[PDB]
Amino acid sequence: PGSMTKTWTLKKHFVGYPTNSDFELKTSELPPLKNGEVLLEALFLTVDPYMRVAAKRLKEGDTMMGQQVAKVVESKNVALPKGTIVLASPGWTTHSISDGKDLEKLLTEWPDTIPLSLALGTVGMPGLTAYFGLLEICGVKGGETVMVNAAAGAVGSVVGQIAKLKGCKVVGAVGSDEKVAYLQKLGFDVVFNYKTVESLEETLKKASPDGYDCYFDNVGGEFSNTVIGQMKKFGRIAICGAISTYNRTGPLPPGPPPEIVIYQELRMEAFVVYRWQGDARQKALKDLLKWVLEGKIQYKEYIIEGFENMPAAFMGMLKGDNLGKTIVKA
Amino acid sequence: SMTKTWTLKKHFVGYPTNSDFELKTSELPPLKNGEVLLEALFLTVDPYMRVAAKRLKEGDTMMGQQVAKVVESKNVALPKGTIVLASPGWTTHSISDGKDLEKLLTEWPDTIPLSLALGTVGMPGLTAYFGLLEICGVKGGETVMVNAAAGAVGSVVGQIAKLKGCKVVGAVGSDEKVAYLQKLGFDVVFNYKTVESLEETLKKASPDGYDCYFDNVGGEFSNTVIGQMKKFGRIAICGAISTYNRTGPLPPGPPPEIVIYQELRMEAFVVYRWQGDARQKALKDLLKWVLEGKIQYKEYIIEGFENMPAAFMGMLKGDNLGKTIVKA
Amino acid sequence: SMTKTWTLKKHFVGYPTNSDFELKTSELPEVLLEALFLTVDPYMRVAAKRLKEGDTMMGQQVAKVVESKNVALPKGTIVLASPGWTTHSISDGKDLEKLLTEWPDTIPLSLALGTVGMPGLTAYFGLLEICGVKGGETVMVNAAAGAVGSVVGQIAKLKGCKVVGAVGSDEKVAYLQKLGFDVVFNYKTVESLEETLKKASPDGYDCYFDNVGGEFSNTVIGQMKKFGRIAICGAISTYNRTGPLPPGPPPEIVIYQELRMEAFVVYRWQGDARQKALKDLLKWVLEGKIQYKEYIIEGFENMPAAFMGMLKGDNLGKTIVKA
Amino acid sequence: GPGSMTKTWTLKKHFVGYPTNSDFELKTSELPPLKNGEVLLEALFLTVDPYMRVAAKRLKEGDTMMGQQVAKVVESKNVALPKGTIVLASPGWTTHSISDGKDLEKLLTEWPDTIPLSLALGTVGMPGLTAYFGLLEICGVKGGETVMVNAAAGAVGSVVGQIAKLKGCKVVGAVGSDEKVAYLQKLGFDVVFNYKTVESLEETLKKASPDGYDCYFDNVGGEFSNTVIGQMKKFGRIAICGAISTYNRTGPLPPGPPPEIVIYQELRMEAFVVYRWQGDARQKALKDLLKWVLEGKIQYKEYIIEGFENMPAAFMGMLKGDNLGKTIVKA
Numbered sequence A: 001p002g003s004m005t006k007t008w009t010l011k012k013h014f015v016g017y018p019t020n021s022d023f024e025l026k027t028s029e030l031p032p033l034k035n036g037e038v039l040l041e042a043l044f045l046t047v048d049p050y051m052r053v054a055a056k057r058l059k060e061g062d063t064m065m066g067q068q069v070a071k072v073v074e075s076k077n078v079a080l081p082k083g084t085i086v087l088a089s090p091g092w093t094t095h096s097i098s099d100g101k102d103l104e105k106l107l108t109e110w111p112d113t114i115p116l117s118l119a120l121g122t123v124g125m126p127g128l129t130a131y132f133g134l135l136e137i138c139g140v141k142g143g144e145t146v147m148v149n150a151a152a153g154a155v156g157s158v159v160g161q162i163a164k165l166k167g168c169k170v171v172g173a174v175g176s177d178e179k180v181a182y183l184q185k186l187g188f189d190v191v192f193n194y195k196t197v198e199s200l201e202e203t204l205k206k207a208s209p210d211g212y213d214c215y216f217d218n219v220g221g222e223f224s225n226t227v228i229g230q231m232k233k234f235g236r237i238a239i240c241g242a243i244s245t246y247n248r249t250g251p252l253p254p255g256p257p258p259e260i261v262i263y264q265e266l267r268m269e270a271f272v273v274y275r276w277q278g279d280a281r282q283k284a285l286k287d288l289l290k291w292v293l294e295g296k297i298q299y300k301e302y303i304i305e306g307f308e309n310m311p312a313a314f315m316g317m318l319k320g321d322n323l324g325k326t327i328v329k330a
Numbered sequence B: 001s002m003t004k005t006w007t008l009k010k011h012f013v014g015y016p017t018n019s020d021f022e023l024k025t026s027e028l029p030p031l032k033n034g035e036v037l038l039e040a041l042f043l044t045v046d047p048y049m050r051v052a053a054k055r056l057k058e059g060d061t062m063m064g065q066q067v068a069k070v071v072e073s074k075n076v077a078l079p080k081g082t083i084v085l086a087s088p089g090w091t092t093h094s095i096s097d098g099k100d101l102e103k104l105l106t107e108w109p110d111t112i113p114l115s116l117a118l119g120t121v122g123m124p125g126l127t128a129y130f131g132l133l134e135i136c137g138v139k140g141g142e143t144v145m146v147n148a149a150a151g152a153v154g155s156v157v158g159q160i161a162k163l164k165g166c167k168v169v170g171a172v173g174s175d176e177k178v179a180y181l182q183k184l185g186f187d188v189v190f191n192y193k194t195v196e197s198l199e200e201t202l203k204k205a206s207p208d209g210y211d212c213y214f215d216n217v218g219g220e221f222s223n224t225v226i227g228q229m230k231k232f233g234r235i236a237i238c239g240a241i242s243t244y245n246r247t248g249p250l251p252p253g254p255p256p257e258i259v260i261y262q263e264l265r266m267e268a269f270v271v272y273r274w275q276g277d278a279r280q281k282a283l284k285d286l287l288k289w290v291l292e293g294k295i296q297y298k299e300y301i302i303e304g305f306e307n308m309p310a311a312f313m314g315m316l317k318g319d320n321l322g323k324t325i326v327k328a
Numbered sequence C: 001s002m003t004k005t006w007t008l009k010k011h012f013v014g015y016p017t018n019s020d021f022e023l024k025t026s027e028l029p030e031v032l033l034e035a036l037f038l039t040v041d042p043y044m045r046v047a048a049k050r051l052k053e054g055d056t057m058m059g060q061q062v063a064k065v066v067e068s069k070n071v072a073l074p075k076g077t078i079v080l081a082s083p084g085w086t087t088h089s090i091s092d093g094k095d096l097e098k099l100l101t102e103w104p105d106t107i108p109l110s111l112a113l114g115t116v117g118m119p120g121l122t123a124y125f126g127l128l129e130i131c132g133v134k135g136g137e138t139v140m141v142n143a144a145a146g147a148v149g150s151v152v153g154q155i156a157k158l159k160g161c162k163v164v165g166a167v168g169s170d171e172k173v174a175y176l177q178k179l180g181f182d183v184v185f186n187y188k189t190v191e192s193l194e195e196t197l198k199k200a201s202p203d204g205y206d207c208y209f210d211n212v213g214g215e216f217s218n219t220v221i222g223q224m225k226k227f228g229r230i231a232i233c234g235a236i237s238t239y240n241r242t243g244p245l246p247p248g249p250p251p252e253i254v255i256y257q258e259l260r261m262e263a264f265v266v267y268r269w270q271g272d273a274r275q276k277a278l279k280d281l282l283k284w285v286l287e288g289k290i291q292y293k294e295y296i297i298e299g300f301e302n303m304p305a306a307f308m309g310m311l312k313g314d315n316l317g318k319t320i321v322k323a
Numbered sequence D: 001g002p003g004s005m006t007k008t009w010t011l012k013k014h015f016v017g018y019p020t021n022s023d024f025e026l027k028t029s030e031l032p033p034l035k036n037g038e039v040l041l042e043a044l045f046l047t048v049d050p051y052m053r054v055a056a057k058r059l060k061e062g063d064t065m066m067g068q069q070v071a072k073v074v075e076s077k078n079v080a081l082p083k084g085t086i087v088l089a090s091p092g093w094t095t096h097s098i099s100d101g102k103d104l105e106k107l108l109t110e111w112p113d114t115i116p117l118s119l120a121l122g123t124v125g126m127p128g129l130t131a132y133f134g135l136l137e138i139c140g141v142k143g144g145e146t147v148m149v150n151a152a153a154g155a156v157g158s159v160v161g162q163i164a165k166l167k168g169c170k171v172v173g174a175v176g177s178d179e180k181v182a183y184l185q186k187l188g189f190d191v192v193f194n195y196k197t198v199e200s201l202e203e204t205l206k207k208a209s210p211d212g213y214d215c216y217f218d219n220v221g222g223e224f225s226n227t228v229i230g231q232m233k234k235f236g237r238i239a240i241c242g243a244i245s246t247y248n249r250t251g252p253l254p255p256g257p258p259p260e261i262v263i264y265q266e267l268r269m270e271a272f273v274v275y276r277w278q279g280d281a282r283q284k285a286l287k288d289l290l291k292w293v294l295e296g297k298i299q300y301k302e303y304i305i306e307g308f309e310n311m312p313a314a315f316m317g318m319l320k321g322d323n324l325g326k327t328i329v330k331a
């Protein structure tokens, strides 16, 4: 019955970092609800680095992709009554219609003490990425020394804290002194500003002269070439992301020295978080929520108010503004 | 006095965005002796501002020139109502002691907008003038390659080349720009973003090669043009706009084997090198050619000082057809 | 005792040249071993960087005992030793390795340096443990006519796998086609490597036994199946590099395809697993399932030329220097 | 009447990176008898030069390697070229050749007996002419400038520095070994450093001349030149002589120089080939070079390798920095 929505679309494909002129806000009228459908109003929307890469497959005019926490504000579906909170991925839009087959309810034990926006962060997709990347790909068992970059981001910050609660030494790389201070307060063994250190090689050597057992890699590029030169024999690399290339203008940087990869017999595996489904996934979500409640994973969010500022939140996150999960409060 | 000032909130990373600029308002001090209050009429945004901004401190005013009017005068040499060129930056009002100003040509007619003092009959036009006539040294009959050919500098380069008897091959970023320059009479114009092979397109435009390369773009584009320069060909290194917003390293240089065998001469320049009589002669020549119709002028005017960042960013993204001007 | 020794006069810059090597003679003062067959291997190009100028080049050899002060290593015994590029050496016996007890007279002793030696074990563990082939997979192997690659392809065939092989000459294409590899092509002459791999297997590749690295591997990665495994054995296209390494593969492809890539050194496997692999390799050669070809060069004084010829792709099979 | 034997180095395989021995092949052939107007030339000294690495790419496998030589007429049916005449000829890497005389060049009439004939391939030959015109016409030095020259201990660079010194210029030279540093310091170069061992190329150039560089005689290119460009004065001149850092490169070319520096500093950069200058201008420069050598203002040093059979090794060593001065092969 006459609903209106706003939608952020891709006006121009990104060249380097996105700029404001690459996005366009549009207003449309959604149709009335059919049988079994619901009207969803966004409460929190997420912006994520993968959107920079996936945008290349969109056509100009398409809606930007993304997930959101929404509530049902109108319902013709008995399973999804008015007021129900759900996870949905209609893209950058304030209102959408769903038949119920593309939604995901929150954990039944979701308490009132934690913001709903953590369903998009530590107790959501980024937290699951840290969980499986560190515990399954690296396979940490306790006592390892873990190198994690973008350590103050949504994924990296959870990687470090899970590593700490599992008995690991953590060396974290971040892009500002404010982020260094925050992670030092959390208790990370060594944290440094990769933008200001005189030599990345010497900083990593001093942080762990014996080398690194695991490398949770979010950045790639020249940074990873240096870390690879300090991996222990049989060292494991979880190839989570390569954000240093997402906004690159020229050709990719050189690859890591193969003589080091082979002599050290490194194991390097990339992964997508959606690989894990069913029981393993549900167990990981329950563990993440439990650790947040127990205080072993502290929660910090970088909230930006206003749907109209979503392009600016996406661009700021890519440029390192965010401390914790970047969230847009509708 | 009340004034608006655009400042650099954050150093650019890639293309500028709105969050990189901040509008500030200030109260200028009273006019002292020999000082005047200038209120902006037209402001210019230029690609060099993207590169020069790196030496500003966060909070500083963006640099730039403007055509301004005297609205208050305590200096007899600059009476109220005088039109001048000044470079206080992105600001609506400023105070000057008079020693850093430049009057317009004494014979400036009312039939041409004052904003061309920032364009074809100003700094961009002088850039095209000296780069083509003194660096390339065109005398008539040469084949000239010019990129960003629909911009402030490139469009003047092509038309001066045409009136000097040169063949002009121009590269632009949209089909609209292809049509405009073809209407002006450029011999060959193409859209570098859509052509299947830049190497093949340039080869057909001139199988004999290029005597001069007026380079506004740089990067991989120039590597290809260099591969088709005639022996002893001259390159005027005016700009390298394809690198101004780069995040990573510069692209490879041209193959030295071609540069050496072809014995190319490549000279960069800043327009302010030319002063005094040579410069004044060039300004008079540009004005004369505009009046005679040999240089048609097109402007990309954006109204509102508050849209000045948006004009800067639109220019960097190729929105402008002609000189980008902000009407105060 | 007196011996011949090839030493490193100058660190390599690009491909080695003769001026980078120097033939020396020394006076030796346990057992005395005289070399019968010596190996040259690509790893020597990289490992030479940690040698000091004047040091002996590293390497393995099949040798003969010509004098004995240890009854456990009596005169006439055939052994494997790694004194480097030298015709004679002194050893206390604790760093030696006898050949398989069931070594037949029908196979040359030089295969202890090849298919039934370190290169064969490299193919064995790289394909069966790292790739984990179980039968039915499509395996991409480059340098398929080399000591390691040729064994990789033949082990894959006897396990029921499709094999796509890359080589540097038409002669190597013909030999591997005779062996029965499903597809073999000359990577130096094909018009488009991407299309050659695409046509050779439009469905993609389950495993990649990588000996070459560089831009070649970037293209293969773009055609790996999801969860595909890569055995990072070698990167010979970079060993003689003068400038910087080429770009890596596009990370969006590596991540989306969730590839598992593990490098290995063959010496990781010891004890029972290694001895089992040696017995399997010897058995497979005798049954005819692994045919052996060797590129033998006569003369210890031509050992540098064998090393350099191997790096340039002259050799078909394991490069061996007969003393 | 009779027929002579000759040896010839050919290109067996195109170079990949630096050349290796297997890329060359020595062949022996029988030259035909001399016809009227022809001479038989025996090589005395042959030159190897960096350009051969690049030009070899257009040869077909089997072709003779290109190059110049000082040769002597050992048999003549040509009255203008009697027995014993010394000439420059470019038959390639070969010990003997037949010429009709139309592609030869006699030595200077005033060539003295006190200087080796091989200098006709070096300081008083093509490399010296390269330094001469690159520094005096392309850079246009007039006296008082500060000149940056790399490969400063090579055939061209060493002459560039010494001409710069006799014209009243400060010279900063870059070389690849400590032995080359010592030699050029003895010659009197103001500053000489080993670019392979210095901690920071940028800081070394800054200290060598805090005011910047008026001219850059560029033999190297690549990343080295990117750093030199960052310290050129306004209106600085660059003579693009060579780019040897790319000749044996395996991967893609290195990044270009920062355009913002090239433009802001209004640099003038011109490439040249030495053969542009012919006739009277060339003869005058040769006379100046010979005069300066005799007066001692240009000292000559040669890196001689004896044996035609070692010509590939001399070419490869020169590319790798073995040579101090002009690389020469004494037949």
Ligand SMILES: NC(=O)c1ccc[n+]([C@@H]2O[C@H](COP(=O)([O-])OP(=O)(O)OC[C@H]3O[C@@H](n4cnc5c(N)ncnc54)[C@H](OP(=O)(O)O)[C@@H]3O)[C@@H](O)[C@H]2O)c1
Pocket: A048, A049, A050, A125, A126, A129, A150, A151, A152, A153, A154, A155, A156, A173, A174, A175, A176, A218, A219, A239, A240, A241, A242, A243, A244, A245, A271, A272, A273, A274, A317, A318, A319, A320, A321, A322, A324, A325, A326, C255
């Ligand atoms: N399934 C998967 O494999 C999966 C899932 C989710 C995310 N990821 C990846 O994991 C990474 C983190 O994602 P997230 O959601 O946690 O984002 P995030 O870390 O919250 O934000 C991105 C951060 O990356 C850093 N960054 C940006 N450009 C950089 C550069 N050139 N070099 C170094 N650091 C740079 C910035 O922090 P600094 O100030 O520290 O630079 C920025 O804050 C991304 O690569 C993303 O694609 C992978």
Ligand SMILES: NC(=O)c1ccc[n+]([C@@H]2O[C@H](COP(=O)([O-])OP(=O)(O)OC[C@H]3O[C@@H](n4cnc5c(N)ncnc54)[C@H](OP(=O)(O)O)[C@@H]3O)[C@@H](O)[C@H]2O)c1
Pocket: B046, B047, B048, B123, B124, B127, B147, B148, B149, B150, B151, B152, B153, B154, B171, B172, B173, B174, B177, B216, B217, B237, B238, B239, B240, B241, B242, B243, B269, B270, B271, B272, B315, B316, B317, B318, B319, B320, B322, B323, B324, D263
């Ligand atoms: N040396 C001097 O004294 C001096 C003085 C003034 C200007 N300049 C230089 O001259 C050039 C033009 O200046 P202008 O004032 O006339 O600006 P303009 O051409 O009016 O505007 C810049 C134009 O460059 C083009 N462009 C942007 N990114 C590009 C890319 N990656 N590749 C190719 N073209 C691209 C766009 O047109 P398309 O649609 O063609 O992409 C855009 O319209 C700049 O390099 C500037 O720095 C030098």
Ligand SMILES: NC(=O)c1ccc[n+]([C@@H]2O[C@H](COP(=O)([O-])OP(=O)(O)OC[C@H]3O[C@@H](n4cnc5c(N)ncnc54)[C@H](OP(=O)(O)O)[C@@H]3O)[C@@H](O)[C@H]2O)c1
Pocket: A262, C041, C042, C043, C118, C119, C122, C142, C143, C144, C145, C146, C147, C148, C149, C166, C167, C168, C169, C172, C211, C212, C232, C233, C234, C235, C236, C237, C238, C264, C265, C266, C267, C310, C311, C312, C313, C314, C315, C317, C318, C319
């Ligand atoms: N422990 C280990 O992990 C281990 C042990 C042994 C060997 N390896 C590695 O496995 C590889 C094979 O060594 P090998 O002992 O079997 O000897 P090999 O295959 O005979 O190695 C030389 C061969 O490599 C090829 N090659 C050389 N340059 C190349 C290039 N740029 N691109 C492609 N192919 C090139 C040539 O054959 P084509 O021209 O036909 O390609 C040449 O015949 C090497 O990378 C070596 O380091 C690893």
Ligand SMILES: NC(=O)c1ccc[n+]([C@@H]2O[C@H](COP(=O)([O-])OP(=O)(O)OC[C@H]3O[C@@H](n4cnc5c(N)ncnc54)[C@H](OP(=O)(O)O)[C@@H]3O)[C@@H](O)[C@H]2O)c1
Pocket: B260, D049, D050, D051, D126, D127, D130, D151, D152, D153, D154, D155, D156, D157, D174, D175, D176, D177, D180, D219, D220, D240, D241, D242, D243, D244, D245, D246, D272, D273, D274, D275, D318, D319, D320, D321, D322, D323, D325, D326, D327
């Ligand atoms: N345009 C012309 O007409 C013309 C004519 C002749 C020569 N040239 C050029 O001038 C240059 C010198 O030629 P030349 O006959 O005098 O040879 P040269 O300097 O006598 O010998 C070459 C020298 O270059 C140096 N070198 C090699 N690779 C290098 C690298 N990657 N980086 C830095 N230096 C490197 C080595 O000295 P270090 O140990 O100091 O590195 C080596 O000794 C070459 O670029 C050549 O192509 C041009």
Ligand SMILES: COc1ccc2c(c1)c(CC(=O)O)c(C)n2C(=O)c1ccc(Cl)cc1
Pocket: A258, A259, A260, A262, A263, C042, C043, C046, C047, C233, C234, C235, C265, C266, C267
């Ligand atoms: C790609 O850069 C290298 C460098 C050194 C290498 C290898 C590869 C390989 C593998 C190969 O590539 O063949 C080996 C075996 N390396 C050794 O030096 C070595 C020697 C003795 C022992 Cl016990 C273990 C290792």
Ligand SMILES: COc1ccc2c(c1)c(CC(=O)O)c(C)n2C(=O)c1ccc(Cl)cc1
Pocket: B256, B257, B258, B260, B261, D050, D051, D054, D055, D241, D242, D243, D273, D274, D275
């Ligand atoms: C940087 O790539 C090259 C390629 C070929 C070159 C040169 C440089 C130079 C300059 C140099 O670098 O020495 C020369 C002289 N080339 C010739 O092959 C040649 C030979 C004979 C004549 Cl008459 C003219 C040119």
Ligand SMILES: COc1ccc2c(c1)c(CC(=O)O)c(C)n2C(=O)c1ccc(Cl)cc1
Pocket: A048, A049, A050, A053, A054, A240, A241, A242, A272, A274, C251, C252, C253, C255, C256
């Ligand atoms: C590095 O280039 C990419 C490109 C696209 C990507 C990712 C990474 C990642 C991983 C990451 O980097 O976050 C994800 C998740 N991509 C998706 O577009 C996507 C979206 C929804 C689903 Cl259900 C599955 C995949």
Ligand SMILES: COc1ccc2c(c1)c(CC(=O)O)c(C)n2C(=O)c1ccc(Cl)cc1
Pocket: B046, B047, B048, B051, B052, B238, B239, B240, B270, B271, B272, D259, D260, D261, D263, D264
């Ligand atoms: C490509 O990197 C740069 C960097 C700075 C530049 C320029 C180009 C150009 C040339 C151009 O690109 O337009 C100019 C004019 N720059 C200035 O900052 C400047 C400002 C005022 C004066 Cl008086 C003199 C110079």
Ligand SMILES: [Cl-]
Pocket: A058, A059, A060
């Ligand atoms: Cl599109």
Ligand SMILES: [Cl-]
Pocket: A199, A200, A201, A202, A226
């Ligand atoms: Cl570093």
Ligand SMILES: [Cl-]
Pocket: A211, A231, A232, A233
């Ligand atoms: Cl270790």
Ligand SMILES: [Cl-]
Pocket: A300
């Ligand atoms: Cl906090």
Ligand SMILES: [Cl-]
Pocket: B010, B011, B012, B050, B053, B054, B055
């Ligand atoms: Cl900036």
Ligand SMILES: [Cl-]
Pocket: B056, B057, B058
């Ligand atoms: Cl600052």
Ligand SMILES: [Cl-]
Pocket: B196, B197, B198, B199, B200
């Ligand atoms: Cl093209």
Ligand SMILES: [Cl-]
Pocket: B209, B229, B230, B231
């Ligand atoms: Cl020409």
